[PDB]
Design a protein around this ligand. Structure first.
Ligand SMILES: O=C1CN[C@H]2CCCC[C@H]2N1
Ligand SMILES: O=C1CN[C@H]2CCCC[C@H]2N1
Length: 330
C-alpha cells in the first residue's frame, strides 16, 4: 500500500504545516501537525477541557463505531517549547492520504497547554519519530508509520515541505519526479528515539564550505533551524545590524536586509537554504526588527534541522531495519 497527503502551512510564515487525517467511522477529519520529533498521535477531542478549546476541530470517539477505549491507558507529553498535553487513549481506524491503519492508538486530550489552545489551526499532532518515545502508559503504543510499515510497498515516508506553499507527505514510495539530481543517504542513530544524523558541514552565502560534523535531528515539527552558537554567529555576522536579543529570545535582523543563503552538508552533497527561507518577519506587527530562521541550539541540548532546513530538500525517512535519512535538492 501507499498514501499521499498534501501538507499546508498554517500561516504566511510557515510557522507549522497541517495535514488532513481521517479518524474513525464515519470519518472525522482533523488537521494534524506531522512531527518527526515525537511519537504520539494526539487530538483535541470531546474530552478536552472546554475552556482549552478555541476553534479546533475535535475528535468525538462516541460517534465512531470503530473506536474502543484502551482501558487504563493514559498519556502525557511535554515538548521542547514548554507546551504540553495529556489524556486517555482510544484505538480507532486512521487514514492518511488513502493509507489506512486499523487499531491505531488515538490519544484523546483531556488537557492542553495555552499555546495549543491559542492555535486554532492545529487539531493535534501525528508523531513520526521512533515508537520508543511514545508516552502511553502502562502499555507503550506504536506510531502510525510503525503500524503501517509492514503493509507499505517500501518501509519509508517522505517529507516535501513547501516554502510559503503546500507540500506533500508520502508513505510507502519515493516520488522520483519530486526532486532533482540524486538522493544522498546518511546514517541514523535511533539511540535517543529521533531521526538523528550528522551533517558534514556548512557554508554561509557564497562563502567557503566548512567541513565539520554537526549531529542533529530531522524534525518536521520544529519551525526553525537550531545549530551550534559558533555556526549561527558566523551566519548572522554576514547580515548588517543583526544581533542576538535576550528580550526577543534569539537573533533578530533589520527587516530591510537581504539575507544570505545557508548550505548544509549531507555526506558529499549540499543542500542550499535560500536566504528568504530564513526571514520570519517582524517580531511584532509593524516592527522593523525581523526574527531570524537560524537560531542557536545552545540552550536545547541537541541541534534541530527543522522546517527551515527540511523545506529546502526532498527528505526520505527510511524505516528499514537499519534506518537512514535521504536528502535531495528540488
Ligand atoms: O514528555 C516527553 C516524553 N519524552 C519525549 C517524547 C517526545 C517529545 C520530547 C519529550 N517529552
Ligand atoms: O517534539 C517536538 C518536535 N515538534 C515540535 C512540536 C512543538 C514544539 C517544538 C517541537 N517538539
Amino acid at each position: 500500500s501507499t498514501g499521499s497527503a498534501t501538507t499546508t502551512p498554517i500561516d504566511s510564515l510557515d510557522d507549522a504545516y497541517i495535514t488532513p487525517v481521517q479518524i474513525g467511522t464515519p470519518a472525522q477529519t482533523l488537521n494534524l501537525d506531522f512531527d518527526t520529533g515525537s511519537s504520539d498521535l494526539w487530538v483535541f477531542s470531546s474530552e478536552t477541557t472546554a475552556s482549552e478549546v478555541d476553534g479546533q476541530t475535535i475528535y468525538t470517539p462516541s460517534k465512531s463505531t470503530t473506536a474502543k477505549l484502551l482501558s487504563g491507558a493514559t498519556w502525557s507529553i511535554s515538548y521542547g517549547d514548554g507546551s504540553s498535553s495529556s489524556g486517555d487513549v482510544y484505538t480507532d481506524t486512521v487514514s492518511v492520504g488513502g493509507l489506512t491503519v486499523t487499531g491505531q492508538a488515538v490519544e484523546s486530550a483531556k488537557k492542553v497547554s495555552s499555546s495549543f489552545t491559542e492555535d486554532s489551526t492545529i487539531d493535534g499532532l501525528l508523531g513520526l519519530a521512533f515508537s520508543t518515545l511514545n508516552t502511553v502508559s502502562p502499555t507503550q503504543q506504536k506510531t502510525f508509520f510503525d503500524n503501517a510499515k509492514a503493509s507499505l510497498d517500501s518501509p519509508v515516508f517522505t517529507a516535501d515541505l513547501g516554502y510559503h506553499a503546500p507540500g506533500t507527505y508520502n508513505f510507502g514510495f519515493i516520488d522520483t519526479t519530486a526532486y532533482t539530481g540524486s538522493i544522498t543517504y546518511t546514517a541514523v542513530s535511533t539511540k535517543q528515539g529521533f531521526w538523528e544524523w550528522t551533517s558534514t558541514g556548512y557554508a554561509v552565502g557564497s562563502g567557503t564550505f566548512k567541513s565539520t560534523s554537526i549531529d542533529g535531528i530531522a524534525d518536521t515539527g520544529t519551525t526553525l533551524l537550531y545549530l551550534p552558537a559558533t555556526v549561527v554567529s558566523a551566519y548572522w555576522a554576514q547580515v548588517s545590524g543583526a544581533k542576538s536579543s535576550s528580550s526577543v529570545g534569539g537573533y533578530v535582523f533589520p527587516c530591510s536586509a537581504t539575507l544570505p543563503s545557508f548550505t548544509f552538508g549531507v555526506g558529499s552533497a549540499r543542500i542550499v537554504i535560500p536566504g528568504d527561507y530564513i526571514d520570519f518577519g517582524p517580531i511584532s506587527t509593524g516592527s522593523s526588527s525581523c526574527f531570524g530562521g537560524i537560531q542557536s541550539s545552545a540552550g536545547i541540548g541537541i541541534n534541530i534541522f527543522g522546517d527551515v532546513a527540511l523545506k529546502a530538500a526532498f527528505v526520505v525517512f527510511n524505516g528499514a531495519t537499519t534506518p537512514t535519512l535521504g536528502f535531495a535538492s528540488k
